[PDB]
Amino acid sequence: IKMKSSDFLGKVSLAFHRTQGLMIMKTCIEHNEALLEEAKMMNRLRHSRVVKLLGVIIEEGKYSLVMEYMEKGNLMHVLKAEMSTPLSVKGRIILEIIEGMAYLHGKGVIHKDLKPENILVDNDFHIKIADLGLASFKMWSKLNGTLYYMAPEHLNDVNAKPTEKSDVYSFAVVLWAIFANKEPYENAIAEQQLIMAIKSGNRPDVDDITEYCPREIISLMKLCWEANPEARPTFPGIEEKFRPFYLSQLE
Amino acid sequence: NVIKMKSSDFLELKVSLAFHRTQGLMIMKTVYKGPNCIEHNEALLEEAKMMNRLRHSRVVKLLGVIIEEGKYSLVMEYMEKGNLMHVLKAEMSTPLSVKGRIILEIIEGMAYLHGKGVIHKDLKPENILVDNDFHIKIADLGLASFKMWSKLNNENELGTLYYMAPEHLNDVNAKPTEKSDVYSFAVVLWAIFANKEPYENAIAEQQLIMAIKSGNRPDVDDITEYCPREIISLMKLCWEANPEARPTFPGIEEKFRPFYLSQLE
Ligand SMILES: C[C@H](NC(=O)C1(F)CCN(C(=O)c2cc(-c3cnn(C)c3)ccc2F)CC1)c1c(F)cccc1Cl
Ligand SMILES: C[C@H](NC(=O)C1(F)CCN(C(=O)c2cc(-c3cnn(C)c3)ccc2F)CC1)c1c(F)cccc1Cl
Incomplete structure (x- = not known):
């Protein structure tokens, strides 16, 4: 949907569409063809757990992407709020993340940058996965803490290709963050030290989860952050074990 | 993945209930029960591997195949409450909130199948199976999508038109599309609120077929229970005579989900 600036009344703003x-x-008139098709690629990903690009503004000197408003912001923001989020809602968040990821991988899409900033939350605490850094969109990205969720095989190795297992690693650390209510690795000394430590087997501190976290989720996070990518499960594999666990115990 | 299971791993509803040892x-x-055809065993296996790729919480799973000498069987997961019509006709009544959720799950199931380039061809309440928590799974029990296994059935010792889009009635070279499945859905929605099959007063099959082809639909006034105005609009839109005028399942999901969340949940 090719939108115009005059239908509303870089930087993120909140905007009111007239209809x-x-x-x-x-x-840059030359890139307009590529940018449009690249946005048409974003729009083909349609699922209840995946944010929707509602349209795009390609004008002279203004290039904008327009998505749906997710009232409660990112996942970390919801987690750090004073109104605590109960175990049943955390479990449902996990299930929905799994569904969103299963959909993306089913379409041959590797996220590459799954993290709480990229998990957006609506007013009823339902989630959608987003790609807000434009990891999957070269031209739009070109036209424009961060490493805690990144699989060790991508740390100090920028040339190796991401896989589905890269996203499984990210998911693992998201699970930890969901129960800790914070970013991992608070007691690290420096970033290069941390990176090397992570590459050598260091992981978020499981004992730093104070609240009740069921044994199954702790097992799951450990399996999903295994150093060998081939040892990590797929998202279909995770869904089939996690869904019945969620229904019996958490729902 | 698919398991090649053996008869010896198991200890009539031919559909039977079976208990696997582990x-x-x-x-x-x-x-099939009859004389040995070793030639088709490769094709039957791979066809079952291919339909085993359709994996989603709202579609039934093929757990295994039995490819033995003179015995060819398919094994699926057991759904404790049977089909949707059986649930709906039961005495212990089903509240609006559970019905709404059922509709959402059917939409999710169908959106997934269509997203894989599968057209069901025979969506109906007998193909909508129900677990003990009243969650649903779409199935293809008559083998509409399994060509070789369907061929094998009609080699050997061993449907309803109420849900069929009017363009396929009296058209033996019928070419179903995604819009054919959307029509079926529409009548499913009606049946969920009526708690019964439509067209009770139809007398003959030719009368009904011709009536439906001329624009007759399930009797909206014959819903006695509360059905929200929106769902009535949705069933009407989904059973539109022109297939191009019916929405897709993603289109349905986007309008239905927020309605479900605000009003029905
Ligand atoms: C299908 C889903 N699509 C997308 O994620 C988007 F289309 C990406 C492009 N978008 C924005 O750039 C955007 C960002 C912002 C924004 C707000 N705050 N900040 C810091 C940034 C505001 C408005 C915006 F339009 C929109 C959402 C997708 C995918 F295509 C590929 C892989 C995974 C996934 Cl999950
Ligand atoms: C992914 C899903 N897969 C399937 O639906 C099945 F694999 C179909 C094959 N199956 C049986 O034939 C079967 C039937 C019966 C049976 C019970 N009652 N009656 C009257 C019959 C019992 C055991 C069985 F194995 C198993 C389920 C699918 C699909 F492949 C294609 C299109 C849509 C859909 Cl939804």
Whole structure:
């Protein structure tokens, strides 16, 4: 959907569409063809757990992407709020993340940058996975803490290709963060030390989860952050074990 | 993945209930009982491997195949409450909130199948199976999508048109599309709120077929229970005579999900 600036009244702003209401907007003639098709690739990913690109503004000197407004922000923001989020809601968040990831991998899409900033939350505490850094979109990205969720095989090795297992690693650390209510690795001394430590087997401190976290989720996070990518499960594999666990115990 | 299971791993509803020695209770459809055809065994296996790729919480799983000498069977997961019509006709009544959730799950199931380039061809309440928590799974029990296994059935010792889009009635070279499945869905929605099959007052099959082809639909006034205005609009839109005028399942999901969340959940 090719939108115009005049339908509303870089940087992120909250915007009011004249016919369609409240959205979030992030703001060279040769690149316009490629940018449009690249946005058409973003729009083909349609699922309840995946954010929707509602459209794009290609004007002279303004290039913007417009997505749906997710009222409660990112996942870390919800987790760090004073109103605590009960075990049943955390479990459902996990299930929904699994569903969103299973959908993306089923379409041959590797996220590459799964992290709590990229898990957006609506007013009823439902989630959608997003690619807010534009990891999957070269031209739009070109036209424009961060490493805690990254699989060790990508740390100090920028040339190796991401796989589905890269996202499984990220998921693992998201699970830890969901129960810890914070970023991991608070007691690290420096980033290069940390990176090397992580590459050698260091992982978030399981004992730093104070609240009740069921044994199954702790087992799951450990399996999903295994050093060998081939030892990590797939998202279909995770869904089939986690769904019945969620239904019996958490729902 | 698919398990090549053996008869000896198991200890009529031909559909039988079967107990696997290490894996418990399943349902078996024994497709062929007769003289040995070793040639088709490769094709039957791979065809079952291919349909085993359709994996989603809202579609049933093929757990295994039995490819033996003169015995060809398919094994699926057991769904404790049977089909949707059986749930709906039961005495212990099903609240609006559970019905709404059922509709959402059917939409999710169908959106997944369509997203894989599968057209069901025979969506109906007998193909909508129900677990003990009232969650649903779509199935293809008559083998509409399994060509070789369907061929094998009609070699050997061993449907309803109420859900069929009007364009396939009296059209023996019928070419189903995704919009054919959307029509079926529409009548499923009606049946979920009526608690019964439509067209009770139809007398003959030719009368009904011609009536439906001329624009007759399930009787909206014959829903006695509360059905929200929105769902009535949705069933009407989904059973539109022109297939191009029916929405897709993703289109349905986007309008139905937030309605479900605000009003029905
Ligand atoms: C299908 C899903 N699609 C997308 O994620 C988007 F289309 C990516 C592009 N988008 C924005 O750039 C965007 C960002 C912002 C924004 C707000 N705050 N900040 C810091 C940034 C605001 C408005 C915006 F339009 C929109 C969402 C997808 C995918 F395509 C590929 C892989 C995984 C996934 Cl999950
Ligand atoms: C992914 C899903 N897969 C399937 O639906 C099945 F693999 C179909 C094959 N199956 C049986 O034939 C079967 C039937 C019966 C049976 C019970 N009652 N009756 C009257 C019959 C019992 C045991 C059985 F194994 C198993 C389930 C699918 C698909 F492949 C294609 C299109 C849509 C869909 Cl949804």
